[PDB]
């Protein structure tokens, strides 16, 4: 009970308009056979082209929605749509390409999947709302067999070349013509009523239906992300390191300590209200302040309503207007004016951040976090937090080659005295690096309007 048994039943009702007469009684084994593939009773790490929900959720970085529409089955041209927004027309002889034979279409499919996936995943998972033409199209661009390694590296093979008779991963596949050992999941097997559009549109207003294959491909993946990461949420599932996950997370800890430490020193709040992750620890353990925690899990669907977070259930309940509120990746509709905020910007392009449901994004860094669409109006009571580095640490090198640092934003005794010491120059440059990492990863920082770094210079005298 890890992989999907090929002897599992497959409901064929979705198939029966493209494939009239299809048996009601159907297994994956029989379906794979009718798709023109032979598994040869093979114990070589590829037991089934189709995978479980649980397996798909572990391989979310690999999801490519895929849809095929009859254009006029051997008779007629097929429109191939992918969640990348690409439409290819294959002839048997929003990006929309003219009709070409399979021998050239399959080359474009490998190039497209390789460019999309090489920095994301070791595989492809085709996310289907299966009606028949998508499954019958696979024999024309897919080959299967035993698990293999790349000819040029140690990564599992994802592509095959009929020219060279060799196997490549996504990194090494230029000129390859076949997708090799793809995986796939039919969303329609999950038990929905009515068509794709009617189910997608319950949850999402951002993906229209232009009645083209890529639109269905996008809607199919969106619906799948909704089901697996919005309505259902599993934070136990770990995901491999593929990028700067570790640097970004370190940077996040450093910036959070820096900004909160400086807010307490500058404005001397007697109480801090720490709203969000119930596992959260004091980010400034030495600070004078009354530190009060409020538990809120990461919201995957809609931003929290500040009315419901701060709702008073009895008298003598905490005054959130006293001191300052820390919302560190706690996404709310509208922050109060007395807030310090870190808010993930869902629009950011990275390998960590996958497109999500209804303008949200699926941010995958150790764990998967569906994040509600970034909204600028949430920040109306605040301003953007400007970059600064602050330290009360002694000017003292210890233990890196130097250009003397000149910066208005290096808030240290040494800079107060007109000359930045080597230690604080090294720390400044490391912190500016951490800060830039975190920003470019898509985090945005917001602060109460009265916040002024000028107030920090008098914390040394």
Ligand X SMILES: O=C(c1ccc(Cl)cc1)N1CCSCC1
| Residues in binding site for S-adenosyl-L-methionine | 274-280
Task: Say which of 18, 177, 186, 216 is annotated catalytic.
Answer: 216
User: Using an 8 Å Cβ cutoff, are 220 and 83 in contact?
Assistant: yes
131 binds, among Zn ion, ligand X, none (CB under 5 to 8 A by kind): none
C-alpha 28/C-alpha 185 separation (Å) is 11
Task: Say which of 69, 177, 227, 244 is annotated catalytic.
Answer: 69
How buried is residue 43: exposed, middle or buried, by Cβ count under 10 Å (0-12/13-18/19+)? Answer: exposed
DSSP H helical ranges for 18-101: 28-34, 53-58
Clarify whether 134 is annotated catalytic: yes
Q: Quote the Cα angle for 227-50-212, to 5°.
A: 65
Residues that constitute the known binding site for Mg(2+): 67, 69, 134, 211, 216
- How many CA atoms within 13 Å lie on the side-chain side of 227? 20
116-155 residues in contact with Zn ion (CB under 5 A) are 150, 152-153, 155
x/- binding map, residues 10-49, to ligand X, per CB under 6 A? Answer: ---------x-----------x--xxx-------------
Regarding 135 and contact with ligand X (CB under 6 A), the answer is yes
Task: Say which of 18, 67, 227, 244 is annotated catalytic.
Answer: 67
Clarify whether 69 is annotated catalytic: yes
Q: Take residue 380 and report the two structure tokens written for it.
A: 């109306």
Regarding 300 and contact with ligand X (CB under 6 A), the answer is no
x/- binding map, residues 191-210, to Zn ion, per CB under 5 A? Answer: -------------x--x---
Clarify whether 67 is annotated catalytic: yes
Clarify whether 308 is annotated catalytic: no
User: Using an 8 Å Cβ cutoff, are 63 and 83 in contact?
Assistant: yes
C-alpha 83/C-alpha 112 separation (Å) is 11
- How many CA atoms within 13 Å lie on the side-chain side of 426? 12
* Minimum CB distance to ligand X, residue 147 (Å): 23
36 binds, among ligand X, Zn ion, none (CB under 5 to 8 A by kind): ligand X
Regarding 136 and contact with ligand X (CB under 6 A), the answer is yes
* Minimum CB distance to ligand X, residue 34 (Å): 4
For the chain, what percentages of helix, strand and coil (3-state, to nearest 5) are there?
30, 20, 50
Clarify whether 7 is annotated catalytic: no
x/- binding map, residues 390-429, to Zn ion, per CB under 5 A? Answer: -----x----------------x-x------x--x-----
In the chain, breaks (C-N over 2.5 A) are found after 72, 93, 399
205-234 residues in contact with Zn ion (CB under 5 A) are 207, 222
* Minimum CB distance to ligand X, residue 142 (Å): 11
Alpha carbon distances (Å) from 179 to 29, 78, 89, 225 = 20, 18, 18, 24
Alpha carbon distances (Å) from 381 to 246, 315, 341, 377, 439 = 32, 27, 11, 9, 21
425-454 residues in contact with ligand X (CB under 6 A) are none
Task: Say which of 18, 59, 131, 134 is annotated catalytic.
Answer: 134
Q: Cα 348 from chain centroid? A: 10
* Minimum CB distance to ligand X, residue 123 (Å): 22
By the criterion CB under 6 A, which residues form the site for ligand X? Answer: 19, 31, 34-36, 135-136, 139
Would you please indicate which residues are annotated as catalytic (active-site) residues?
67, 69, 134, 211, 216
């Amino acid at each position: 009970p890890t992989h999907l048994s090929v002897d599992t039943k497959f409901k064929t009702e979705g198939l029966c308009v493209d494939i009239p007469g299809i048996p009601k009684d159907m297994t994956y084994r029989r379906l794979i056979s009718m798709m023109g593939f032979k598994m040869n009773y093979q114990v070589n790490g590829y037991p089934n082209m189709f995978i479980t929900r649980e397996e798909a959720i572990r391989h979310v970085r690999a999801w490519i929605g895929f849809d095929v529409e009859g254009c006029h089955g051997t008779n007629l041209p097929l429109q191939l749509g992918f969640s990348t927004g690409v439409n290819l027309v294959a002839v048997p002889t929003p990006l929309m390409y003219k009709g070409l034979p399979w021998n050239v279409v399959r080359i474009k499919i490998v190039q497209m999947l390789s460019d999309t996936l090489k920095n994301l995943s070791d595989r492809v998972v085709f996310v289907l709302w299966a009606h028949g033409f998508e499954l019958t199209s696979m024999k024309y661009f897919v080959k299967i067999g035993p698990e293999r390694t790349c000819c040029l590296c140690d990564r599992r093979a994802t592509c095959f070349s009929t020219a060279s008779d060799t196997y490549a991963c996504w990194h090494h596949s230029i000129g390859f013509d076949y997708v090799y050992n793809p995986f796939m999941i039919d969303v329609q097997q999950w038990g929905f009523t009515g068509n794709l559009q009617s189910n997608h549109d319950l949850y999402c207003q951002v993906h229209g239906n232009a009645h083209v294959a890529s639109c269905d491909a996008i809607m199919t993946r969106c619906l799948a992300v909704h089901e697996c990461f919005v309505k259902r949420v599993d934070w136990t599932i770990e995901y491999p390191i593929i990028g700067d996950e570790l640097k970004i997370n370190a940077a996040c800890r450093k910036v959070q300590h820096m900004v909160v430490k400086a807010a307490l020193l500058a404005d001397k709040f007697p109480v801090l209200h720490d709203i969000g992750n119930p596992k959260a620890i004091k980010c400034v353990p030495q600070a004078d302040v009354e530190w009060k925690f409020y538990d809120a899990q990461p919201c995957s669907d809609k931003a929290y309503k500040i009315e419901e977070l701060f709702y008073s259930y009895a008298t003598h309940s905490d005054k959130f207007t006293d001191g300052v509120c820390l919302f560190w990746n706690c996404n709310v509709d509208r922050y109060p004016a007395n807030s310090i905020v870190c808010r993930f910007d869902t629009r950011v392009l990275s390998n960590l951040n996958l497109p999500g449901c209804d303008g949200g994004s699926l941010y995958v860094n150790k764990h998967a976090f569906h994040t509600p669409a970034f909204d600028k109006s949430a920040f109306v009571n605040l301003k953007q937090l400007p970059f600064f580095y602050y330290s009360d640490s002694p000017c003292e090198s210890h233990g890196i080659d130097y250009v003397p640092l000149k910066s208005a934003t290096c808030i240290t005794r040494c800079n107060l005295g007109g000359a930045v010491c080597r230690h604080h120059a090294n720390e400044y440059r490391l912190y500016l690096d951490a800060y830039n990492m975190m920003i470019s990863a898509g985090f945005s920082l917001w602060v109460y309007k009265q916040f002024d770094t000028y107030n920090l210079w008098n914390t040394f005298t």
